[PDB]
């Protein structure tokens, strides 16, 4: 299913690698505007075995990056797909994680859906034809358990491809108690940066379809309500004025293009 929500104030990272304290520095970049539209998405898959077929996967546009937020039990969401034109006519991205590993490729992948027959590989591409770049190492996401589901982890990702150097800004905020995107402010820091060289305007995600649960089905659309537990938001070039805490973190930042007061 699909539903809408209000991003409130969220999606602010450190543009630069310079340490600041009690500084009101401002900077302009692909920032998620405050109080914007963030769209839920859900992959209903409880009757997949009883025929039916999922039939629930769109091609999310990527224009000027994508903001990502989700709450998975352990590893429900593993990776993403970027690129354009889908077919081997043009390249694509295959960011995907496993255990303590990440493998990403810029190879001309032709596919149709996003499964991997795991909870393995394949099912998400059929062309290792003219691959250009490969990457490995530590995964973006480190799971931490509070011994219960009340402390739902929130995994805030911001993706950018300005002249390569893929942005994987990530942070863990397990203080959530059930409310969707709770009121408050958090900073956001990168992990890895590497150019890929590709015109990206398509975006998709990977779900652990071989064993899925809690996927209600309905006809919710056009600003309706529906449980999806998976967030996507688009960035636009925005000037941001950031307050750096005396310790060095970010306490609060104000947009420069939303309200006259801002």
């Amino acid at each position: 299913t699909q539903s809408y929500t209000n991003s409130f104030t969220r999606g602010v990272y450190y543009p630069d690698k310079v340490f600041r304290s009690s500084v009101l520095h401002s900077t302009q970049d692909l920032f998620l505007p405050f109080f914007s539209n963030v769209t839920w998405f859900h992959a209903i898959h409880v009757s997949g075995t009883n025929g039916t077929k999922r039939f629930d996967n769109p091609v999310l546009p990527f224009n000027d990056g994508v903001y990502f937020a989700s709450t998975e039990k352990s590893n429900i969401i593993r990776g993403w797909i970027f690129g354009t034109t889908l077919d081997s006519k043009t390249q694509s991205l295959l960011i995907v994680n496993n255990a303590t590993n990440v493998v990403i490729k810029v190879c001309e992948f032709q596919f149709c859906n996003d499964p991997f027959l795991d909870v393995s590989e394949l099912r998400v591409y059929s062309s290792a034809n003219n691959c250009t770049f490969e990457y490995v190492s530590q995964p973006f996401l480190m799971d931490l358990e509070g011994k219960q589901g009340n402390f739902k982890n929130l995994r805030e990702f911001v993706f950018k491809n300005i002249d390569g150097y893929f942005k994987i800004y990530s942070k863990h905020t397990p203080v959530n108690l059930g409310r969707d995107l709770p009121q408050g402010f958090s900073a956001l820091e990168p992990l890895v940066d590497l150019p890929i060289g590709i015109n990206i305007t398509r975006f998709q995600t990977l779900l652990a379809l071989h064993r899925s649960y809690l996927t209600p089905g309905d006809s919710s659309s056009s600003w309706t309500a529906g449980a999806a537990a998976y967030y996507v938001g688009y960035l636009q070039p925005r000037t941001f004025l950031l307050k750096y805490n005396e310790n060095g973190t970010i306490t609060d930042a104000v947009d420069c293009a939303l309200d006259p007061l801002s």
Partner: peptide
């Protein structure tokens, strides 16, 4: 990920 620092 930070290497250098900055004052005002």
């Amino acid at each position: 990920f930070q290497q250098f620092g900055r004052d005002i």
